[PDB]
Write a protein that binds this ligand. Structure first.
Ligand SMILES: Nc1ncnc2c1ncn2[C@@H]1O[C@H](COP(=O)(O)OP(=O)(O)OP(=O)(O)O)[C@@H](O)[C@H]1O
Ligand SMILES: Nc1ncnc2c1ncn2[C@@H]1O[C@H](COP(=O)(O)OP(=O)(O)OP(=O)(O)O)[C@@H](O)[C@H]1O
Ligand SMILES: Nc1ncnc2c1ncn2[C@@H]1O[C@H](COP(=O)(O)OP(=O)(O)OP(=O)(O)O)[C@@H](O)[C@H]1O
Ligand SMILES: Nc1ncnc2c1ncn2[C@@H]1O[C@H](COP(=O)(O)OP(=O)(O)OP(=O)(O)O)[C@@H](O)[C@H]1O
Ligand SMILES: Nc1ncnc2c1ncn2[C@@H]1O[C@H](COP(=O)(O)OP(=O)(O)OP(=O)(O)O)[C@@H](O)[C@H]1O
Ligand SMILES: Nc1ncnc2c1ncn2[C@@H]1O[C@H](COP(=O)(O)OP(=O)(O)OP(=O)(O)O)[C@@H](O)[C@H]1O
Ligand SMILES: Nc1ncnc2c1ncn2[C@@H]1O[C@H](COP(=O)(O)OP(=O)(O)OP(=O)(O)O)[C@@H](O)[C@H]1O
Ligand SMILES: Nc1ncnc2c1ncn2[C@@H]1O[C@H](COP(=O)(O)OP(=O)(O)OP(=O)(O)O)[C@@H](O)[C@H]1O
Ligand SMILES: [K+]
Ligand SMILES: [K+]
Ligand SMILES: [K+]
Ligand SMILES: [K+]
Ligand SMILES: [Mg+2]
Ligand SMILES: [Mg+2]
Ligand SMILES: [Mg+2]
Ligand SMILES: [Mg+2]
Ligand SMILES: [Mg+2]
Ligand SMILES: [Mg+2]
Ligand SMILES: [Mg+2]
Ligand SMILES: [Mg+2]
Lengths: 309, 309, 309, 309
């Protein structure tokens, strides 16, 4: 298997806290937070670790929050390659409400990057050897022009780095601007925005995915469909995989778990069907766990065996 | 095609109202309500009308609220057969919040039924011809012992009335106590309560469904799975049908729409596959319409065509 | 003491129910409701009963819901004078959420009145002897022109009936159109709407209340101020009364409790200070009790003793 | 006028963000946060600046978040005296929901303080001149034994530093353990916890306040009562001051604004009446401004003039 790297331009040090009730105006007393790594590529690398593989997470880190982020990943045995940034690593908030069992997730932008910090990040990316896989996942932080992301991807592909993309909005469109992306995983909202049209008819998702493949923007499009599983599209195949009928406890982290799983199958040169099935297995495995916990090896294996008959 | 009847032991006259915001403590000023028919069997009959068929709704009605319920169904051209009850027809409340677009649904028990009234309802059911279909759908109202529900179904079956059951809790178990039910449609929670175990493993739903068929309790079990569609089980077949990837606007009425569709297919003596496909098409068609609106013929046809492609 | 009557043109049979959690989209299973009398004048009469006096509630009642409303008042020993109405007595909903202890209150319009039913109600009102007190409290139901309310009040005053008004919006303005109202109790929002201006400066409430008295619209204006108590205004006096610093459990019914209390003091020809103090005592006593329960005699007496030094 | 200092053992760098709707499970996309100074003593110092006075804020600051906190105060021209702490300055989150206009406030503990750092803070406090005022306001951060808070206050008082305390829980009791506190401002809940009993009777708050004065624990006790204003108690006087009837826009910052105002009055050696009046004026002035904004000079002056009329 070739080596796997992930890139998170907007990582975070997330706080998970608990409060008895939720209501406006008054002070909600919240417990001492538990800190956890945040960010698309970072969680993809964590999911891969859970599944028994290894992925090196590349990301900017700033201030004491950044140091703690790196410290957390060290304890989880997730290898990293960081760039020191001036602006401190930002924090998102996850609140569990004890009385209802509900969770609330407040997602703010990542820290700013200056041009020099982005250049260092690109330098880290270009140290990746030909044939290896790079997963670019997450939002685009302030300070980065859209074309800089496209230029990074182009440079990467130029020296044989195989790119996988999970993003949204203008970043996702920009990441796909040059094309030849190995794999992209939009969810339904992300797909609709990317093809710039509403997907209201039964066959619209399939057709939109095929449109992306046919255009040369991506070799593989896996449209993830929440509880309905996913639809994977190749130049030769269209397959839908639906998860088993088991209740979701918490959907947080399903997307990153699926991407990490599919990345591993891509590294193994698996078939489209095997890739999508393993992706659904890990994404749905993620839903079995409370709060922000990602997929576990054993749950993913169990669901994958079910999906494989 | 044989004739179709439905039975709703706990009907309601539902109020749909609108308010700008939702918050506790203060008076929420709600608009003058729009009244609509409520109740499982009643909604099955309405869905059947939408799909081009005809079903007679049997139910107790009491007071001016009951009169209005009857009048609403007359205006919708749904045939009825009623028993006048002493306790007035109860009301559930549907609240649309303008600021969020969210809907809140407060579901209270149906009016009480005395023993005389239940025997009157039983008399109506036993006037149904042999070979016709009776759909018993909805909650069990106060005043009716579970044994009486068992007795009604046993009485109906002895003379060739084909029974379809959609209920929950002790009522569902009681309805299946006699066995030889033509079709039962539990959702996942209802199936779990019926077999009395958590269904936490991938194959648990299928195994539970097969257990009910094998035990002779039901000829067909269709476990409905929300956005995952449904799993249909026979003595000979097992199929899962997943809806197309279209966004749900409002899930209200999905269950009764699905039951209405499957009932029509059952009356046409369709295959298990055709029955479940049409059921999923109608159930998911219902979700395309806002609020409490059930499935439309055209949306159901479109989804069914896709599933049958 | 002279006799006391209340008029409720829009009464209701309210349902109080309990549900474990509150959230949109899904069915919220609510307990078998406890029915209670609803409507301004009706609750004023109930509050008066709690305080040891007697008030006859005049109101339209229709259908089985109306009969149960009358039945509830009989059990509480509240004398009534009803007019049978064609349109059935409507229901508001009070929902207690067990997990949070919050209550939600959905308030819909009252049943319609036709011209004949209103004429009968006016006839009941004009049977009231000179010197007696009539409390007109609550919203204006559909079917009643604004000037009909004004004409009723004018006719009442013409034969010596002393009128007290608690209402809002166009109804309140109309009720005050002719003037010489003995007592009106707007809250702050109601006062602002009545004088048609925002009350943003420290002395604005006082000035607005005095404007109403000086105009001849009302002899006494008691602006109720929620937790801040009330400001009472006469042609000769301006007094603010603030409740004791005890936590409110539930504010439902505070307004009607205050009005019933003030009505009793008006019947005793009490001073403005005594009237307002007893009103604050009963209104704040109401807040000590969970849900919709009105003021208790003992709590009101205790707070009144405190307010009187 | 003597000099004024404040002490905030648990400061914060607060993030204020905006999101369109609030609901659980999904990612709530929040705007790039606006940062603001947080913490009891810090806010007291800011309120004092608004009211035209000057107060030096003493607090631990750590990391880039602490640097930003210090920078924000510099921009607001609030003098500070800081101790560099190992643990980085923590962040609370204020969320405005656009659809409802509601604000949600998630309050987490302050950064940890080690024993060395606390002694450094103690050293700063003991550099305050005799006769000057020190306001100790806010929660107690992890790492500080209650006895150390008692020791700090005892140390300060021995050399003529006049101490004002605003806190809660065990910290408030510990702060009052030494006695001879110049002024304490519990709210109702804080007073109840302090005297360890429910305050359910009309005179309970006053009696509890007098108990603290009589015991020698505090020279002055001002129990703040939210919209009911405040009750101020001396060895010689007892007064209640109620704000004018103006609608609160947002209650955030009322407490610290009130403390800032009373501190300034205390420095001017004002009467108990003048102190409580100005306190209520500033507290209520704070409520006129949206979000976390404290009292403005002009609004405070306007309310104070009314209270003094
Ligand atoms: N259980 C609740 N449900 C809904 N709203 C609440 C609830 N508790 C408090 N609130 C709201 O919060 C406001 C203040 O509540 P609270 O008694 O906690 O004071 P606080 O200012 O938040 O905290 P503190 O005691 O530290 O001063 C109330 O006015 C109310 O609007
Ligand atoms: N409610 C659910 N029940 C079962 N499986 C789910 C559920 N939601 C997500 N999954 C699984 O996780 C996979 C990915 O989730 P989804 O399609 O929601 O992507 P995403 O929106 O990009 O995730 P995320 O919000 O974490 O970024 C799905 O394809 C599916 O396998
Ligand atoms: N927009 C809102 N968001 C959250 N809570 C609210 C909102 N509006 C009102 N409330 C709550 O409802 C209580 C009263 O609100 P409101 O001003 O509507 O008075 P009311 O008693 O409900 O009605 P009325 O004016 O008829 O007397 C407030 O104390 C507050 O707790
Ligand atoms: N979120 C959804 N998206 C797409 N289709 C749906 C969704 N929810 C329900 N359906 C369709 O409706 C059918 C029945 O709905 P479901 O499985 O939820 O039954 P139910 O819980 O008995 O419904 P109900 O609550 O109305 O009684 C499903 O099998 C599916 O076809
Ligand atoms: N604890 C909860 N918090 C927030 N939302 C919930 C919660 N429980 C259910 N919901 C919402 O209600 C929808 C359906 O929930 P549920 O499992 O109760 O099915 P139902 O259609 O309401 O009832 P039924 O079992 O009778 O078919 C869910 O899709 C979810 O959106
Ligand atoms: N939160 C509270 N705390 C203490 N007393 C209260 C509170 N709210 C109301 N009261 C008492 O009840 C009296 C009337 O309540 P309020 O001023 O809110 O009138 P209202 O809005 O017309 O009441 P309602 O909504 O029931 O019709 C007040 O003057 C006061 O004495
Ligand atoms: N307007 C809403 N009201 C109530 N709940 C909502 C609303 N929008 C989303 N949700 C809840 O959040 C879940 C996911 O919402 P959403 O479409 O935003 O996906 P997401 O996972 O939060 O974000 P993303 O598109 O980045 O993957 C839904 O399943 C639903 O439960
Ligand atoms: N809803 C309100 N309306 C008018 N004035 C208010 C209101 N709430 C607070 N105030 C003013 O602010 C002063 C202090 O507020 P409060 O009694 O709530 O203290 P607190 O609970 O310590 O404040 P905080 O939660 O900010 O720390 C009050 O005495 C009063 O003057
Ligand atoms: K999870
Ligand atoms: K619908
Ligand atoms: K009450
Ligand atoms: K404010
Ligand atoms: Mg995603
Ligand atoms: Mg998602
Ligand atoms: Mg159902
Ligand atoms: Mg359901
Ligand atoms: Mg009122
Ligand atoms: Mg009110
Ligand atoms: Mg405070
Ligand atoms: Mg407070």
């Amino acid at each position: 298997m070739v080596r796997i790297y992930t890139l998170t331009l907007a990582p975070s040090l997330d706080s998970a806290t608990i409060t008895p009730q939720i209501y406006p105006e008054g002070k909600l007393r919240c417990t001492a937070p538990v800190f956890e790594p945040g960010g698309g590529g970072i969680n993809v690398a964590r999911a891969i670790a859970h599944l028994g593989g290894s992925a090196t997470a590349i990301f900017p880190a700033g201030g004491a929050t950044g140091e703690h982020l790196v410290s957390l990943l060290a304890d989880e045995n997730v290898p990293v390659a960081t760039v020191e940034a001036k602006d401190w690593t930002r924090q998102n908030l996850h609140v569990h409400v004890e009385a209802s069992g509900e969770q609330y997730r407040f997602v703010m932008p990542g820290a700013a990057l200056n041009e020099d910090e982005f250049r260092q990040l690109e330098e880290q990316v270009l140290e990746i050897e030909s044939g290896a896989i790079l997963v670019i996942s997450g939002s685009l932080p302030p300070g980065v022009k859209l074309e800089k992301l496209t230029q990074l991807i182009s440079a990467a592909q130029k020296q044989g780095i195989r790119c996988i993309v999970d993003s949204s909005g203008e970043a996702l469109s920009a990441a796909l601007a040059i094309g030849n992306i190995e794999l992209v995983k939009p969810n339904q909202k992300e797909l609709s925005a990317l093809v710039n049209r509403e997907l209201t008819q039964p066959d619209d998702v399939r057709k939109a995915a095929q449109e992306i493949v046919n255009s040369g923007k991506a070799k593989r499009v896996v449209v993830s469909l929440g509880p309905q599983g996913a639809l994977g599209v190749d130049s030769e195949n269209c397959i839908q995989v639906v998860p088993p009928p088991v209740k979701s406890q918490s959907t947080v982290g399903a997307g990153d778990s699926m991407v990490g799983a599919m990345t591993l199958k891509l590294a193994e040169n698996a078939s489209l069907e095997e890739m999508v099935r393993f992706g659904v297995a890990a994404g749905s495995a993620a839903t079995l766990n409370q709060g922000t916990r990602l997929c576990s090896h054993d749950d993913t294996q169990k669901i994958y065996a079910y999906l494989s008959r």
